[PDB]
Structure 1
Amino acid sequence: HMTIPDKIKAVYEKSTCLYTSNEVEAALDRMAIKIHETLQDKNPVIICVMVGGLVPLGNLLHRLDFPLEVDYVHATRYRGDLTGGDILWKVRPSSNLAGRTVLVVDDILDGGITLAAIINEIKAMGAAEVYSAVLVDKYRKRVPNGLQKADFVGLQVEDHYIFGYGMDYHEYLRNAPGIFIVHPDHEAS
């Protein structure tokens, strides 16, 4: 029968490139400058939001020229859970975050209900300050209970079906070198 990797190849092959890898790297440079201005003297814990935060965070980290520690967190949500109150935790924020400045890093702000719950849970562990960073923000789309603004944003995009540079298409294509839009043939509407 038809194979998942063959279908992935077809999706990628038919996709359209919204941003090159170079443009993405350039957006990471801009973020880094801003993050430095805000955080350099704050000894932050930088927390990767799994799994999507991993590519952006790893590429951002060596651009940040100040003392910092790294950690990670993992939460999922049912789409039907509109409040963020039924969140499924796989990896919880640690007690070590008490009194710390924390920067939370994710691939994309898309509503951000789940990102807001993660942030609030970090606050509940006693963090002094929580900032948010996102490689891409779907800037026109905001939802109740969602995160209204990220502190640091690489790229602002319209509401497309997108993948790459940490963003998956059914777990695949996080390794695509840029930001891509799924072809209308493969957009299940």
Structure 2
Amino acid sequence: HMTIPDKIKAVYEKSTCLYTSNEVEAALDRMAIKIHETLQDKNPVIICVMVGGLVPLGNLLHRLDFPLEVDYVHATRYRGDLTGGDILWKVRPSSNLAGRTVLVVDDILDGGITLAAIINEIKAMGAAEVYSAVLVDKYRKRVPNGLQKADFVGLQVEDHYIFGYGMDYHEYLRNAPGIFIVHPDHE
């Protein structure tokens, strides 16, 4: 009977397009300019926040024209975890970050807890400066211990269930060419 790949095609067919890939590229361009002005002379280590950060960072990187390094980090947060302690670390920041300017790049700012915990841990390693870049910002959705606002924001959105351009629908659909809203039948 019915498969997961079958449901995924269906989810995609029922979805509503919120941003075309061209609009995302535009947002990525806007961010690049802002990142340039701030970080061009900082010799930053740009940290990809796995796995949501992958396609945004990939597309963003070649728009960045100043010396930089790349690294990555991976952390997961439980549903009911509001402190930031009790977040599972898959890939930790390194001591190499000590005395370095760091830019953290993720797909979405929601509650803000994952990214705050990640930033704290990067700081705990001795990073001179820490910035944050986010493709989408769910501006109406912070919680007290969350990273309140990000330094660089591609797009501002309402609380939709969204996917595409690195954002998953249950691990699928990171490859969808834009930002899509999940039909209420599929949320």
Same fold (TM over 0.5): yes
Shift of 1:81: 1.4
- What's the TM-score once normalised by structure 2's chain length? 0.99
Q: Deviations over 1:127-184 (max 9, x none)?
A: 0000000000001111110010000000000011100100000000000000000001
Of stretches 29-38 and 76-85 in structure 1, the one that deviates more from structure 2 is 76-85
Query: 2:145 matched to which residue of 1?
Result: 145
| CA-CA distance at 1:48 after TM superposition | 0.1
Secondary structure of the 1:185 match is coil
Structure-2 residue corresponding to 1:155: 155
Q: Which moved more, 1:75-84 or 1:2-11?
A: 75-84
Whole-angstrom distance in 2 between the partners of 1:109 and 1:81: 16
Deviations 1:58-95 (A, max 9, x none): 00000000000000000001111110101100100001
Secondary structure (helix, strand or coil) at the match of 2:126 reads coil
Deviation at 1:3, TM superposition (A): 0.4
CA distance in 1, matches of 2:123, 2:87: 16
Alignment of 1:1-189 (within 5 A): 1-187=1-187
TM-score of the superposition, structure 1-length normalised?
0.98
* Secondary structure of residue in 1 paired with 2:185: helix
22-31 or 139-148: which moved more?
139-148
CA drift of 1:185 comes to: 0.8
User: RMSD value over aligned CA atoms?
Assistant: 0.5
Q: Provide the rounded CA distance (Å) in 1 between the counterparts of 2:81 and 2:136.
A: 23
Percent identical pairs in the alignment equals 100
Which region of structure 1 is more displaced relative to structure 2, 134-143 or 41-50? 134-143
- Tell me how far 1:112 sits from its aligned partner: 1.2
CA shift, 1:115, in A, is: 0.7
SS at match of 2:104: strand
1:109 CA drift (Å): 0.3
CA distance in 1, matches of 2:127, 2:182: 38
> Using the alignment, how far apart are the partners of 2:69 and 2:125 within structure 1?
17
Q: Distance in 1 between matches of 2:89 and 2:159?
A: 27
Mapped partners of 2:61, 2:112: distance in 1: 23
Bigger CA drift: 98-107 or 135-144? Answer: 135-144
Q: Distance in 2 between matches of 1:107 and 1:85?
A: 22
Count of residue correspondences: 187
Report the Cα offset of residue 123 of structure 1: 0.2
